[PDB]
């Protein structure tokens, strides 16, 4: 039975191949997404990645740099946008508590406002699209100066665009996603607290750390050339041959 | 048909005669690869090289 | 009974692109998850908890016939170790042995490892009924039931079914990883031949 | 042959949806999927236009849209390929052989059209039509011929009776038919199809 | 631990009446369908992900999940929800993989009543022609 | 039964408005989070307030591209709206120069008010909206992505640093609840921000059709 | 600038080692003394750390516009 | 007993068909290998086109035609 689902699925997507520009297209000049699943990474160490594997890449350290040859490469990638990208994030997040929440331009303007308008008594016909204690403020908005205008409509754009999404990871360096530099970032300050608080040999500073890992990320990812179809066509194939428990 | 033995490599798989003798591959002889392909001329479809 | 098809190809073309895109040894692990597909044999894993625990004395001539045996003569000129106690004879001890392997099987260039990872076999797989009741010592530390491997030569711990197998967080699964394929290959065939012979 | 009419000789379906499946077409030549689906707002009529029009809808946007995408790097005298449009393409004609397939009674003439029959050796059958349509036709021209049987009129039909059948149907519906059987602009060729 | 009760059939117009005794925004259905038409498509993935992991994880296994959420963005990209064992596979530029699929003389059918020129990319096409093709090795030359 | 009619009146006024507020027309923050009791204070009874229109809320200004435009929110009271009341608000619509107005009903409307609809469209663009389709949000959902509408200069900017066609991006008929949500028509495109558990937050540019 | 990466893509280093294999297998120029082993398999290790590769390598963009890169403009590496 | 006979089968060259100058099989006159459908498949699946060329191309039915 296991067999023959194999078989039957075998009929499927051949032509995938994942151009040079990163973004999985297909045969026929069609892009079908832009980035592979998350991006890059077909698991061919993503294993070894993200979870509790760096203890390991702790020690050993020197090997995986000079093996790496890192001042082989630093004079073709800039770790520049992928610093001040990251801190403004920081910042955005740790200004704004629940992104999930309704907010505009004048909204905090009218909370503002709202102990204002009231403590003065303005009411009126509940007209046409309004109550009373609102039409007032909805037009005083109009002759307030654009100057706290600028200073509320700076604050209300979002939190900007993933680096992934702006910077193609292959060139520009230490391009992480966002549920890994939170990984990175865990563990440089739970070692470094960590180890000055242990017996500490360890010649290894906290930036070396972040640029070691960085650069296997930037190893990790998938070069062109490999038609990613016929991968999820065997890797869908493989339990649709090993079904056969029951 | 295929036998479980140890003595080949996990990276290597130990061939008969009959394939290893039967099959070849071509090469201009050039003024290095000189002794390898005579013995091979030399020798042929009866012992291996 | 099942069969098994054999090619050879014509050019150098199809030649190497079966020697390293199509090989185990820069192929080593399954791609679909991350972990390694040609681990070690099972026959060869008694062999493994027989040699590398706690005592097996071989005296200088047993040990460097080991050695050669299990080293695919290629190689030139075969380094050394010293032996491990010196009183009476310079004996040897296992661990010894096999990181000898190790020390010349690791290229020139680079330098052995470290790790301090975990073995199958629990703590009390050997356990007796009761200690006498004397607190500060743990049966947790200072066990044989984790692989301490500091700059390439054994310390403590044996070598059971998670390292040399095929798994996550293994000795050829590391190997491979910051080597390269090919060395990772090679001590796995190497560390057969020992462990046959 | 199914989804045609015996007596006009055209297709079953009327000639509005068919016009505008033309208009659909001709834009799926090059391969546009938004401006199909903002056609459909809009009706079809015949090839004219006239200053201060009536209470009419347009055929020219098509024309407009063309010489459009044209003009800014979007169209050549290839035509463009890509997958998007050959799964609309796909759908698009498999909806237009179900219009095909699900049509009894003509809208033009109101004629009988008796059901036609596939065999698997390669022959066509005719099927004389129930007492339904012989009574529900008109008191003119009836599916009925003059003469009198027993049930069952089941015939055989000459391939020449077909082919001249065919001949009219194509030399009738060729500014669709052509566009139907050439996927890639007909710039090359620019000749008319033939039933032969 | 959210308290949850076990319901059985697609009727989602109506599970609003209850509006306030339930979570109504923490709610998605064994349908696929059910939930299109009322929440969207970015609606149906999550389940259509959702539904494929249990249905291998009953038995253990489960593949990466990467290889689900690339078939959910091939399998449904134009709106529509469509299948792949004919439906979906029918929209590729080569005819000529589909003549490999099921039966040639079908898909040498629409090859002749379209009338393409292949752009020679996919696999099938130039494999066949006898040149070397984008796959794996093949995207470029010396 | 009055209690659940207004109950429902004063869920679509919350939703109306968080429809205006996403639709981004300016309302104030008072009103969005408004108690249903409160409510009860601007209108009372089912019969006492007049439940046709003592409560359409016509007014509220596009204010970002210029305070002129007003779109236009009606409540009607024949479960098959006929297009007599149609040609009413044609009327009203002319009269006041609004082009954009939203209906509700609730039962559904008479097909041929939607084609009435249809010929009048160009400038009136009046959306159809059963009672039952903004019953609850289909954005306060879980699995259902975070959009925003880009400018034809951003999408310009794609188009630019992919160099690709508009025939490989994916692809959406307005018929889907989310499109009408907003008022999206054709050859517009809506990045999605839909996160993910891989890493997550794709952006991913998809085109109306 | 590219928008491909300097960076070694195995597919490109282990099919153009194999085209190189082929190179010295038939009728080339020997560029590095062959120090013994006259198979360019065993070479080819030292044609590439001794960077004798002129070998023009073709990436093709995502439909025609291609770069072209010598192997040594990679990062190359352990 | 032998379950099946367990001969072997080997070709590099020599008599191939008529028809379609393919090598035969049969192992009484050394017959070669078969690629089904499945070994097809994965030849599409792996993402190669020169081992196609070459052992498809090259070596089953080489002929230099006109046209």
Same mark, same amino acid.
């Given at each position: 039975?296991?067999?023959?689902?194999?078989?039957?699925?075998?009929?499927?997507?051949?032509?995938?191949?994942?151009?040079?520009?990163?973004?999985?297209?297909?045969?026929?000049?069609?892009?079908?997404?832009?980035?592979?699943?998350?991006?890059?990474?077909?698991?061919?160490?993503?294993?070894?990645?993200?979870?509790?594997?760096?203890?390991?890449?702790?020690?050993?350290?020197?090997?995986?740099?000079?093996?790496?040859?890192?001042?082989?490469?630093?004079?073709?990638?800039?770790?520049?946008?992928?610093?001040?990208?990251?801190?403004?994030?920081?910042?955005?997040?740790?200004?704004?508590?629940?992104?999930?929440?309704?907010?505009?331009?004048?909204?905090?303007?009218?909370?503002?406002?709202?102990?204002?308008?009231?403590?003065?008594?303005?009411?009126?016909?509940?007209?046409?699209?309004?109550?009373?204690?609102?039409?007032?403020?909805?037009?005083?908005?109009?002759?307030?100066?654009?100057?706290?205008?600028?200073?509320?409509?700076?604050?209300?754009?979002?939190?900007?665009?993933?680096?992934?999404?702006?910077?193609?990871?292959?060139?520009?360096?230490?391009?992480?996603?966002?549920?890994?530099?939170?990984?990175?970032?865990?563990?440089?300050?739970?070692?470094?607290?960590?180890?000055?608080?242990?017996?500490?040999?360890?010649?290894?500073?906290?930036?070396?750390?972040?640029?070691?890992?960085?650069?296997?990320?930037?190893?990790?990812?998938?070069?062109?050339?490999?038609?990613?179809?016929?991968?999820?066509?065997?890797?869908?194939?493989?339990?649709?041959?090993?079904?056969?428990?029951? | 048909?295929?036998?479980?033995?140890?003595?080949?490599?996990?990276?290597?798989?130990?061939?008969?005669?009959?394939?290893?003798?039967?099959?070849?591959?071509?090469?201009?002889?050039?003024?290095?690869?000189?002794?390898?392909?005579?013995?091979?001329?030399?020798?042929?479809?009866?012992?291996?090289? | 009974?099942?069969?098994?098809?054999?090619?050879?190809?014509?050019?150098?073309?199809?030649?190497?692109?079966?020697?390293?895109?199509?090989?185990?040894?820069?192929?080593?692990?399954?791609?679909?998850?991350?972990?390694?597909?040609?681990?070690?044999?099972?026959?060869?894993?008694?062999?493994?908890?027989?040699?590398?625990?706690?005592?097996?004395?071989?005296?200088?001539?047993?040990?460097?016939?080991?050695?050669?045996?299990?080293?695919?003569?290629?190689?030139?000129?075969?380094?050394?170790?010293?032996?491990? +106690?010196?009183?009476?004879?310079?004996?040897?001890?296992?661990?010894?042995?096999?990181?000898?392997?190790? +020390?010349?099987?690791?290229?020139?260039?680079?330098?052995?490892?470290?790790?301090?990872?975990?073995?199958?076999?629990?703590?009390?797989?050997?356990?007796?009924?009761?200690?006498?009741?004397?607190?500060?010592?743990?049966?947790?530390?200072?066990?044989?039931?984790?692989?301490?491997?500091?700059?390439?030569?054994?310390?403590?711990?044996?070598?059971?079914?998670?390292?040399?197998?095929?798994?996550?967080?293994?000795?050829?699964?590391?190997?491979?990883? +910051?080597?390269?394929?090919?060395?990772?290959?090679?001590?796995?065939?190497?560390?057969?031949?020992?462990?046959?012979? | 042959?199914?989804?045609?009419?015996?007596?006009?000789?055209?297709?079953?379906?009327?000639?509005?949806?068919?016009?505008?499946?033309?208009?659909?077409?001709?834009?799926?030549?090059?391969?546009?999927?938004?401006?199909?689906?903002?056609?459909?707002?809009?009706?079809?009529?015949?090839?004219?236009?006239?200053?201060?029009?009536?209470?009419?809808?347009?055929?020219?946007?098509?024309?407009?849209?063309?010489?459009?995408?044209?003009?800014?790097?979007?169209?050549?005298?290839?035509?463009?390929?890509?997958?998007?449009?050959?799964?609309?393409?796909?759908?698009?004609?498999?909806?237009?052989?179900?219009?095909?397939?699900?049509?009894?009674?003509?809208?033009?003439?109101?004629?009988?059209?008796?059901?036609?029959?596939?065999?698997?050796?390669?022959?066509?059958?005719?099927?004389?039509?129930?007492?339904?349509?012989?009574?529900?036709?008109?008191?003119?021209?009836?599916?009925?011929?003059?003469?009198?049987?027993?049930?069952?009129?089941?015939?055989?039909?000459?391939?020449?009776?077909?082919?001249?059948?065919?001949?009219?149907?194509?030399? !009738?519906?060729?500014?669709?038919? !052509?566009?139907?059987?050439?996927?890639?602009?007909?710039?090359?060729?620019?000749?008319?199809?033939?039933?032969? | 631990?959210?308290?949850?009760?076990?319901?059985?059939?697609?009727?989602?117009?109506?599970?609003?009446?209850?509006?306030?005794?339930?979570?109504?925004?923490?709610?998605?259905?064994?349908?696929?369908?059910?939930?299109?038409?009322?929440?969207?498509?970015?609606?149906?993935?999550?389940?259509?992900?959702?539904?494929?992991?249990?249905?291998?994880?009953?038995?253990?296994?489960?593949?990466?999940?990467?290889?689900?959420?690339?078939?959910?963005?091939?399998?449904?990209?134009?709106?529509?929800?469509?299948?792949?064992?004919?439906?979906?596979?029918?929209?590729?530029?080569?005819?000529?993989?589909?003549?490999?699929?099921?039966?040639?003389?079908?898909?040498?059918?629409?090859?002749?009543?379209?009338?393409?020129?292949?752009?020679?990319?996919?696999?099938?096409?130039?494999?066949?022609?006898?040149?070397?093709?984008?796959?794996?090795?093949?995207?470029?030359?010396? | 039964?009055?209690?659940?009619?207004?109950?429902?009146?004063?869920?679509?006024?919350?939703?109306?408005?968080?429809?205006?507020?996403?639709?981004?027309?300016?309302?104030?923050?008072?009103?969005?989070?408004?108690?249903?009791?409160?409510?009860?204070?601007?209108?009372?009874?089912?019969?006492? /307030?007049?439940?046709?229109?003592?409560?359409?809320?016509?007014?509220?200004?596009?204010?970002?591209?210029?305070?002129?435009?007003?779109?236009?929110?009606?409540?009607?009271?024949?479960?098959?709206?006929?297009?007599?009341?149609?040609?009413?608000?044609?009327?009203?619509?002319?009269?006041?120069?609004?082009?954009?107005?939203?209906?509700?009903?609730?039962?559904?409307?008479?097909?041929?008010?939607?084609?009435?609809?249809?010929?009048?469209?160009?400038?009136?663009?009046?959306?159809?909206?059963?009672?039952?389709?903004?019953?609850?949000?289909?954005?306060?959902?879980?699995?259902?992505? /975070?959009?925003?509408?880009?400018?034809?200069?951003?999408?310009?900017?794609?188009?630019?640093?992919?160099?690709?066609?508009?025939?490989?991006?994916?692809?959406?008929?307005?018929?889907?609840?989310?499109?009408?949500?907003?008022?999206?028509?054709?050859?517009?495109?809506?990045?999605?921000?839909?996160?993910?558990?891989?890493?997550?937050?794709?952006?991913?540019?998809?085109?109306?059709? | 600038?590219?928008?491909?990466?300097?960076?070694?893509?195995?597919?490109?280093?282990?099919?153009?080692?194999?085209?190189?294999?082929?190179?010295?297998?038939?009728?080339?120029?020997?560029?590095?003394?062959?120090?013994?082993?006259?198979?360019?398999?065993?070479?080819?290790?030292?044609?590439?750390?001794?960077?004798?590769?002129?070998?023009?390598?073709?990436?093709?963009?995502?439909?025609?516009?291609?770069?072209?890169?010598?192997?040594?403009?990679?990062?190359?590496?352990? | 007993?032998?379950?099946?006979?367990?001969?072997?089968?080997?070709?590099?060259?020599?008599?191939?068909?008529?028809?379609?100058?393919?090598?035969?099989?049969?192992?009484?006159?050394?017959?070669?290998?078969?690629?089904?459908?499945?070994?097809?498949?994965?030849?599409?699946?792996?993402?190669?086109?020169?081992?196609?060329?070459?052992?498809?191309?090259?070596?089953?039915?080489?002929?230099?035609?006109?046209?």
């Amino acid at each position: 039975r296991s067999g023959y689902l194999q078989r039957c699925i075998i009929k499927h997507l051949e032509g995938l191949v994942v151009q040079y520009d990163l973004t999985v297209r297909d045969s026929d000049g069609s892009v079908v997404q832009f980035l592979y699943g998350e991006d890059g990474l077909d698991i061919p160490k993503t294993q070894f990645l993200q979870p509790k594997q760096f203890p390991f890449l702790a020690s050993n350290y020197e090997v995986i740099m000079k093996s790496q040859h890192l001042h082989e490469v630093l004079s073709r990638a800039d770790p520049k946008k992928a610093l001040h990208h990251f801190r403004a994030i920081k910042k955005w997040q740790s200004k704004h508590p629940n992104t999930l929440l309704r907010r505009g331009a004048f909204l905090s303007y009218s909370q503002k406002i709202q102990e204002a308008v009231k403590a003065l008594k303005l009411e009126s016909e509940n007209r046409n699209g309004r109550s009373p204690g609102t039409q007032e403020m909805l037009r005083m908005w109009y002759e307030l100066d654009e100057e706290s205008r600028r200073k509320y409509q700076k604050k209300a754009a979002a939190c900007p665009d993933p680096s992934l999404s702006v910077w193609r990871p292959d060139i520009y360096f230490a391009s992480v996603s966002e549920t890994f530099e939170t990984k990175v970032d865990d563990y440089s300050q739970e070692w470094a607290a960590q180890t000055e608080k242990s017996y500490e040999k360890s010649e290894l500073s906290l930036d070396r750390l972040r640029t070691l890992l960085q650069l296997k990320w930037q190893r990790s990812l998938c070069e062109p050339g490999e038609a990613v179809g016929l991968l999820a066509a065997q890797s869908i194939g493989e339990p649709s041959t090993q079904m056969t428990l029951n | 048909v295929i036998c479980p033995d140890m003595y080949i490599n996990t990276n290597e798989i130990g061939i008969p005669m009959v394939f290893a003798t039967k099959l070849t591959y071509p090469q201009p002889v050039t003024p290095w690869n000189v002794q390898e392909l005579r013995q091979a001329v030399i020798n042929g479809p009866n012992v291996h090289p | 009974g099942d069969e098994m098809n054999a090619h050879f190809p014509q050019s150098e073309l199809g030649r190497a692109e079966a020697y390293v895109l199509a090989c185990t040894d820069q192929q080593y692990l399954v791609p679909k998850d991350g972990q390694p597909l040609a681990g070690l044999i099972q026959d060869h894993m008694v062999s493994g908890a027989s040699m590398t625990t706690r005592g097996c004395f071989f005296t200088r001539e047993h040990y460097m016939e080991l050695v050669y045996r299990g080293l695919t003569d290629k190689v030139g000129r075969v380094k050394l170790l010293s032996p491990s +106690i010196l009183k009476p004879f310079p004996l040897w001890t296992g661990k010894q042995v096999v990181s000898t392997l190790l +020390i010349n099987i690791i290229p020139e260039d680079h330098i052995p490892l470290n790790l301090s990872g975990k073995a199958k076999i629990t703590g009390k797989a050997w356990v007796k009924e009761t200690p006498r009741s004397v607190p500060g010592f743990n049966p947790d530390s200072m066990c044989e039931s984790q692989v301490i491997i500091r700059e390439g030569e054994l310390l403590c711990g044996v070598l059971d079914k998670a390292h040399y197998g095929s798994s996550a967080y293994g000795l050829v699964h590391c190997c491979y990883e +910051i080597y390269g394929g090919e060395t990772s290959g090679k001590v796995l065939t190497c560390l057969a031949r020992l462990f046959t012979a | 042959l199914r989804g045609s009419c015996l007596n006009c000789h055209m297709l079953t379906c009327p000639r509005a949806v068919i016009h505008l499946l033309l208009c659909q077409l001709r834009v799926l030549e090059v391969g546009a999927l938004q401006a199909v689906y903002e056609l459909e707002r809009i009706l079809n009529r015949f090839l004219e236009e006239n200053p201060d029009p009536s209470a009419s809808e347009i055929r020219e946007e098509l024309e407009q849209y063309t010489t459009e995408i044209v003009q800014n790097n979007l169209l050549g005298s290839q035509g463009a390929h890509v997958k998007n449009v050959c799964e609309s393409k796909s759908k698009l004609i498999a909806l237009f052989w179900k219009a095909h397939m699900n049509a009894k009674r003509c809208p033009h003439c109101k004629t009988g059209r008796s059901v036609v029959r596939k065999e698997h050796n390669s022959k066509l059958t005719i099927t004389f039509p129930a007492m339904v349509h012989r009574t529900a036709g008109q008191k003119d021209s009836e599916p009925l011929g003059i003469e009198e049987a027993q049930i069952g009129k089941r015939g055989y039909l000459t391939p020449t009776s077909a082919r001249e059948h065919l001949s009219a149907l194509w030399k !009738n519906e060729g500014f669709f038919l !052509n566009y139907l059987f050439s996927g890639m602009d007909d710039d090359g060729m620019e000749s008319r199809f033939n039933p032969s | 631990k959210e308290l949850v009760l076990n319901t059985e059939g697609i009727n989602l117009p109506e599970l609003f009446k209850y509006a306030e005794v339930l979570d109504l925004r923490r709610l998605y259905s064994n349908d696929i369908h059910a939930i299109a038409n009322t929440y969207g498509i970015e609606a149906a993935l999550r389940v259509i992900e959702k539904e494929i992991k249990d249905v291998f994880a009953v038995y253990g296994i489960a593949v990466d999940p990467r290889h689900l959420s690339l078939v959910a963005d091939y399998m449904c990209f134009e709106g529509v929800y469509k299948p792949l064992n004919r439906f979906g596979i029918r929209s590729n530029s080569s005819p000529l993989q589909q003549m490999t699929f099921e039966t040639s003389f079908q898909f040498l059918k629409q090859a002749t009543m379209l009338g393409s020129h292949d752009e020679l990319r996919s696999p099938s096409a130039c494999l066949v022609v006898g040149k070397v093709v984008r796959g794996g090795t093949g995207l470029f030359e010396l | 039964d009055d209690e659940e009619e207004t109950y429902r009146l004063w869920k679509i006024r919350k939703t109306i408005m968080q429809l205006c507020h996403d639709r981004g027309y300016l309302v104030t923050q008072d009103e969005l989070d408004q108690t249903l009791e409160e409510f009860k204070a601007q209108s009372g009874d089912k019969p006492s /307030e007049g439940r046709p229109r003592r409560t359409d809320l016509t007014v509220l200004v596009a204010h970002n591209d210029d305070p002129t435009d007003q779109m236009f929110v009606f409540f009607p009271e024949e479960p098959k709206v006929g297009i007599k009341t149609i040609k009413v608000y044609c009327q009203r619509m002319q009269e006041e120069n609004i082009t954009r107005a939203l209906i509700v009903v609730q039962q559904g409307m008479t097909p041929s008010a939607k084609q009435s609809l249809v010929d009048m469209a160009p400038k009136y663009i009046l959306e159809q909206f059963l009672q039952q389709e903004l019953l609850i949000n289909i954005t306060e959902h879980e699995l259902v992505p /975070e959009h925003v509408v880009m400018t034809k200069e951003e999408v310009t900017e794609l188009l630019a640093r992919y160099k690709l066609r508009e025939n490989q991006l994916p692809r959406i008929q307005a018929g889907d609840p989310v499109a009408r949500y907003f008022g999206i028509k054709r050859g517009q495109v809506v990045k999605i921000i839909r996160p993910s558990e891989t890493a997550g937050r794709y952006i991913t540019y998809r085109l109306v059709q | 600038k590219r928008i491909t990466t300097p960076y070694m893509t195995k597919y490109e280093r282990a099919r153009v080692l194999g085209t190189r294999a082929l190179q010295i297998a038939m009728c080339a120029p020997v560029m590095v003394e062959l120090e013994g082993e006259t198979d360019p398999l065993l070479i080819a290790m030292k044609e590439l750390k001794a960077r004798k590769i002129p070998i023009i390598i073709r990436r093709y963009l995502p439909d025609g516009s291609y770069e072209d890169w010598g192997v040594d403009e990679l990062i190359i590496t352990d | 007993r032998h379950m099946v006979s367990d001969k072997f089968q080997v070709r590099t060259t020599g008599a191939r068909d008529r028809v379609t100058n393919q090598p035969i099989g049969g192992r009484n006159v050394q017959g070669g290998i078969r690629f089904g459908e499945m070994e097809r498949d994965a030849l599409l699946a792996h993402g190669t086109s020169f081992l196609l060329h070459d052992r498809l191309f090259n070596c089953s039915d080489r002929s230099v035609a006109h046209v």
